[PDB]
């Protein structure tokens, strides 16, 4: 039928549909004015002008300007024939274009990938108050330790996250226990004294330390003081994952570490 | 720079804005929630699930089994790679697709081609817009050139239509060209050319002519060019069919040929 | 009030409608969270952490990240000098990109300008069918001349456009008539005859010629029912300018 | 190309996609009507007529002395250069308008910032996203400073501050500032220089340091640098009031502040 090749038409050769509808009317009827398309075609009136003058533009057809304008088919096989070749010479200069978009993001996007290092998520500092929401952060940054984790505890923490610390212990996370004399007893019965003398963790003690600390693989978790937080009683702490904070509570934690035993 | 890296993605990759912007994210930051994409970058909050879902589809992201899903940057280099390819491989499909309905086509319509009848003739002038499109008619001109044909040409009027220029020569057409000098090297070698070097038609070069034409038996298609239009592929090219306007264009070619050099 | 200050933000200093009633409330009460913010303010309560947080991004606030977010506003003083500074330079690198844009469009648009062939948009081919539509585009073309006027003439266009093409002469244009013999005798009391001898206008001769034509500045308009053919062209009409001078040749008186 | 003449009108001198064309469609062919546009250019037919209004209210047309079916383009230089005269002076208008509702903005809050508590302040640590928002903590540290300055800045922490940290400097702040050695050529003006070399602060430079930060007194603003979160604006930088962390830190800036020279 008719409606065949406007649809062929419509979908391979970008026309569109009134535009389909008028070229095959041009093609059935050779010559047409606007107007005799309107009764020709099914093209909107005000739109006949406007469509044949596109088809004209397309190289789908020709024309005798005048006050009536007469518009002749360009036959199809040419037309369908130049427009295949046209259209192929698009896609081969457009493949060269994305290969250049190609090389221009790479060389854009180099900036974004040379940092080899702070690879991160975006979520760096995390705020913690309350007792119940810091063991619970304690407790993910234990599961979620891979190679090490020191400690400098005068908790409230071996007790009872032992369960957690030991898991990571048995997990053959390099750990390292640094806790105040003062609560050394307070352990005489734990699991953390016997890997300590099997023993798979190193366990220390100091009189007392001033800054606290739980760093777990580029991940640091200590508390602000100021002045009676505990037992009066609120918990005001800061966790921060980057290598280059805790190389400073690092250093600090292995100042307080060598003080052995 | 960001803007210039979505620029490039959204035009070429087919990435939408939110898509473009989100994988440059991706590439920054390494891995994003939905949650994290929204505050990082201009995609408004409920929309960030469904575009990196979409580049995770499309190649762009990489993501776990679930539900705890975070996204990940593929890397460019093997993403851009891919999408051509994929695109390549697209186009080659739609090629056919064309050159199948072409002829489905050209099968609807000829019973309407063929005693069409075709109504023109009796027109005696028509306009074609377009310097490019010049050859939907200087191909009919050359089908039905039974006497002779002069052809001055800068390149858009009928050369390129060798087989049917040669054809008219070898049923005895006698045939003139003259070219510019800017045609003598993308004439090369040619299948044209040694037409004229076996005396089978006369060829000769000219600096510039200001008036290109084809004439094919007291029918004369001749172009308004302006390089003004060219930027909106908008000359005024004419077709005439009427030996005196002929005569003065033939007379013009003829007057171009002693300039002509070998 | 407080009213004031949300449309001030809003209109100077790009905050939307939800971020300027959440900044002047964060003003007001130093520390919030998206969800007091939601039974402090106007903003939807599904809303207040975006916003909250794109003032975060924005500048006009601070945050504690936790199960609670805390946030805090940035002083006005600090914030609203610090959008006008950055705002001022961002204009300004946009100014000189104007400038750079400026140029760029002048060297693109050379070539436009450069290539002088000061032709209309118009279309400069027209198709005339009919004698009606003829004696009006004839006229029009009689009526816009302003250099010359060559006229090839076996009509029925002389007969009678007369009032037309001595409207011309009378306007200082060059007018040469050239018409057939065979009819001449017809404009013996005509006023183009007159203007002839007077003379304004050259006027010859010929009982036969193969293409009349009028001619009217870079215009040609000659006949192939009856088609006639209009040319704007300064290439074309040479053409038909060399072939009129050759009918030219001569006669009287 | 067409298409860059259409983009660089449609992203700096504010015509829409089909005035843009319209104009250029204009300066090439001279003079059009409405229906000549539409012909020409890829604007819609019935757009025609409401685009090269717009164009003369613009200044980008001009309608022709007698009828006025046809438009004219104004060239280029008389437009391009007429649209940048009203374009700076239009962003003047505004630079004082926003800079006049500042002060209102400011005499507006003064029942809630002057004589203020401040209800905030009581909190010993805030997050500042966008490095180049730092300055919007730092300047108050800076303020409150009486004791001790230590500035090791990249460029965006607080050397852009100099009216506050000189202000500091003369009332007896010790103060030692740290710069990348990439913002020398700049900060030759200065307040800081001379007072670098007058020997009321001192003033040392290092090729690269991996931890930007400001401490004054009992308290540290530092950076979590990272391009390219750079990028998206969204680097993460920290407030403490915390003598131990600021110790830390103070400890890291003597380390950075030894070989740094100059
Ligand atoms: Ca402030
Ligand atoms: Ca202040």
Not at 93 to 121: D, F, H, N, Q, R
Not at 154 to 165: K, W
Request: aromatic fraction near 10%.
């Amino acid at each position: 039928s008719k409606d065949r090749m406007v649809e062929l038409l419509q979908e391979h050769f970008e026309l569109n549909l009134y535009e389909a509808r008028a070229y095959v009317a041009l093609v059935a009827f050779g010559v047409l004015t606007p107007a005799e398309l309107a009764s020709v075609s099914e093209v909107p009136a005000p739109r006949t002008y406007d469509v044949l003058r596109s088809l004209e533009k397309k190289g789908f057809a020709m024309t005798q300007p005048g006050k009536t304008n007469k518009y002749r088919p360009v036959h199809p096989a040419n037309v369908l024939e130049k427009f295949i070749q046209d259209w192929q010479e698009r896609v081969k200069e457009e493949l060269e274009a994305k290969k250049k978009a190609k090389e221009e993001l790479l060389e854009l996007m180099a900036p974004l990938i040379e940092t080899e290092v702070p690879k991160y998520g975006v979520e760096r500092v995390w705020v913690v108050r309350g007792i119940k929401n810091s063991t619970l952060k304690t407790k993910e940054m234990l599961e979620e330790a891979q190679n090490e984790i020191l400690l400098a505890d005068d908790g409230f923490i071996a007790v009872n996250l032992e369960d957690d610390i030991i898991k990571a212990v048995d997990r053959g996370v390099k750990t390292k226990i640094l806790l105040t004399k003062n609560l050394l007893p307070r352990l005489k019965a734990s699991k953390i004294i016997d890997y300590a003398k099997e023993g798979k963790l190193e366990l220390r003690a100091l009189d007392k330390f001033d800054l606290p600390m739980l760093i777990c693989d580029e991940e640091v978790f200590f508390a602000l003081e100021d002045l009676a937080a505990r037992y009066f009683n609120y918990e005001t702490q800061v966790w921060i994952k980057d290598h280059r904070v805790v190389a400073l509570f690092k250093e600090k934690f292995n100042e307080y570490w060598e003080k052995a035993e």
